[PDB]
Amino acid sequence: SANNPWTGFQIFLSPYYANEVAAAAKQITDPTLSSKAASVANIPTFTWLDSVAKIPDLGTYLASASALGKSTGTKQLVQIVIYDLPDRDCAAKASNGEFSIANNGQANYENYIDQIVAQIQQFPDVRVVAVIEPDSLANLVTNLNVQKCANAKTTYLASVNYALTNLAKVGVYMYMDAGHAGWLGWPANLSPAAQLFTQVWQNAGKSPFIKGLATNVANYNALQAASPDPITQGNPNYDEIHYINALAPLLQQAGWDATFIVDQGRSGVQNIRQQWGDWCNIKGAGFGTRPTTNTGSQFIDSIVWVKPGGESDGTSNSSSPRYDSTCSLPDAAQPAPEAGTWFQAYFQTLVSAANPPL
């Protein structure tokens, strides 16, 4: 559409990922692979506000971006993920978070958003693009029979609404997480998904800052598959482009000219999954298509790297309170550390298997 949030901005590179990547690159023994790995720090990624502890980091990113804009004569754009719902990750165990509904969670989440808003308010010269709460709304479309999700539904809807409503007041451009083609892209799920997203968009006042939806976050699907991955049997929407082409018209009819961003950060190697629902630390993945607004689709504002490759999806240690058996499947890299922490061997495979090559 007319207003792509990326037009006219330089993306501020993640300092958090840059620090992980720089340290990772010096441990890659092959010199050629090491320089390729270090270059990953110059590829724009989203930085996750996965705990309240990350909010001061956001302040430093905004302040550094503001200064860099003035020094270089540009307008800077900071890419973040809002990811701290109470009872987070309701249909899995790997990414449970610090807030719980039974321990003051909804109010704590409000305070988390308020502190984020207070940082962003100080730097109106910096644009912010935020992905809102990966997995949450998709779980409310398809997984209401999961009791943790059912019990979390009102809290998720309230909290997501609070985030959208308040981040809009400081001009944040927002893409609500919308799963991926193997989750909400099933033709039968398209309309339930559209109805929920439209309701959420209406509840937040149809703000122009709510641009649309993010897809494939922390997943591995192709944007445009050469051949349909065998895992997609039964679903004519076998890649992200098919999913988006099928979902976007439903949003437009409901009144929302929604646009999309698509994670490709771990899509470089296809055919690594035994089953479509194998989401955890998939062995042999490589970095995918670099971020770009040259997306080939009327509905897609940008290809993006949302999940930072190298950060684990979940522990394979069955003794941890966050153990999910998806992370021990024959196609999951093991042993794997706790979700969100650095997985050096996984990062080095992502570099070596990058497609296009680094």
Ligand SMILES: OC[C@H]1O[C@@H](O[C@H]2[C@H](O)[C@@H](O)[C@@H](O)O[C@@H]2CO)[C@H](O)[C@@H](O)[C@@H]1O
């Ligand atoms: O995409 C990552 C998230 O996957 C979630 O599981 C989905 C899965 O991706 C789909 O392929 C399909 O199997 O339905 C699942 C939902 O039950 C998972 O719950 C999340 O933790 C992942 O972040």
Ligand SMILES: OC[C@H]1O[C@@H](O)[C@H](O)[C@@H](O)[C@@H]1O
């Ligand atoms: O790596 C990005 C995100 O991945 C999630 O699976 C983890 O739970 C988060 O801690 C992390 O911020």
